[PDB]
RNA sequence: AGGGUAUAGCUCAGGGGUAGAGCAUUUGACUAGAUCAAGAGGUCCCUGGUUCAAAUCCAGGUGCCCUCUCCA
């Protein structure tokens with residue numbers, strides 16, 4: 084609709100092209116079709132998901148209560164507008180709020196401000212512009228000025244600049260709460276509000292300090308993963324890559340905080356964020372450690388590392404290229420950087436399989452779209468580890484696996500791949516809201532999401 | 544079969560031989576700054592290798608980073 088395709092390096096886009104135009108897909112669909120599919124994907128990746136999805140912390144508040152409180156909250160934020168809050172029938176603890184956009188009639192002001200690409204993406208998802216996000220602003224900006232926020236999608240704006248000839252993307256208008264002086268004079272690492280978005284291109288609720296013990300902003304497939312893993316109360320679960328602990332706290336909440344959830348991460352501050360989240364949401368069965376997942380198997384003779392076959396369930400939410408991220412308007416990565424994940428994923432996978440009890444469940448999940456990080460890893464896993472066996476999932480929401488890794492149709496039907504190019508981009512407005520069938524909205528929330536991949540394994 | 548990165552206070556270009564920009568800061572004019580000028584600035588992370596010569600190329604070491612909604 085409003086935004087162009089995701090700005091990729093020629094080599095990278097050709098890499099992904101090689102991915103989606105393999106012999107098998109061409110065979111079962113034809114070049115003319117697969118190419119259009121790929122281009123449609125690239126066109127969709129630049130646009131926000133049509134649904135703000137919120138996970139309810141059932142261990143502190145029920146979905147009903149939280150939904151009502153959020154109804155009051157949306158009443159306040161949108162000055163009395165009328166956007167619905169659906170409840171997913173399959174994901175019992177997930178709420179869905181439709182996105183009102185895009186709005187092409189926003190009049191651009193002269194006082195401008197430029198944020199980082201990531202901050203821009205956050206703004207498109209319904210966030211305000213907080214102080215650490217601004218990397219450029221009009222030198223004549225005073226606190227209170229109605230300014231126009233632009234996203235430096237290329238990340239080429241040198242901080243503090245008074246002008247920018249690079250690539251900007253209009254995100255909308257907002258009331259500033261700081262002058263350019265207050266921001267860039269001296270070096271105060273100041274926090275707080277910077278630009279209160281009043282007329283965003285996409286209208287989504289701001290989830291900063293609202294019900295922090297009851298909510299958790301989480302993409303639909305991410306919330307789905309913990310359900311697919313299906314943790315039982317009293318079991319021993321471990322996710323190698325956990326920070327900041329969305330799926331971790333979700334797993335803990337599904338177990339009614341009765342059991343043991345060990346969460347690892349390589350970076351310290353991230354682990355601290357895990358612990359902070361767990362403490363915030365009221366989960367006590369969560370124990371977080373700063374540790375290398377690839378070296379998590381006990382070898383010497385003396386917390387991690389852990390003995391092999393000592394965990395009931397294991398979640399590998401492996402680090403990835405993150406190509407399935409939405410909205411992602413540009414990606415200035417090298418191809419070597421994009422394909423730099425398969426080995427690490429395989430190491431973490433091996434460490435996971437070794438750490439898994441017999442008849443245990445291993446859920447491997449990424450947020451990327453590449454074959455080499457998804458289906459290929461499933462094939463590799465099924466070959467190297469013959470004790471593992473691919474399992475069907477519940478709930479089944481996303482599409483089936485992509486052809487190309489040499490898996491059978493029966494095998495692909497047991498994978499869950501979310502495709503951004505599944506359904507057309509819905510340009511929702513209030514008139515579209517009023518005349519909308521509920522099943523259409525639910526299908527929309529299930530299909531128009533970020534790129535994601537879920538695979539389920541069982542040991543013998 | 545993991546990868547990227549380290550350069551001025553901040554944000555970053557560059558590049559085998561005299562250290563570069565924007566912003567911040569400093570000073571001087573014009574009416575505190577939507578003006579004009581002027582200069583203050585860095586063992587280019589550590590170590591070793593290649594080389595006449597490494598801030599640049601290579602290897603090892605270390606720190607930071609590779610999202611999976613919102614203080615960026």
Ligand SMILES: C[S@@+](CC[C@H](N)C(=O)[O-])C[C@H]1O[C@@H](n2cnc3c(N)ncnc32)[C@H](O)[C@@H]1O
Nearest residue numbers: 324325326327328329330348349376400402611
């Ligand atoms: C996709 S993110 C985690 C999202 C998280 N699972 C949730 O659902 O919020 C991958 C994480 O992997 C961690 N990580 C990166 N390398 C790792 C490694 N070798 N071992 C363990 N964790 C790693 C990163 O610090 C990052 O927090």
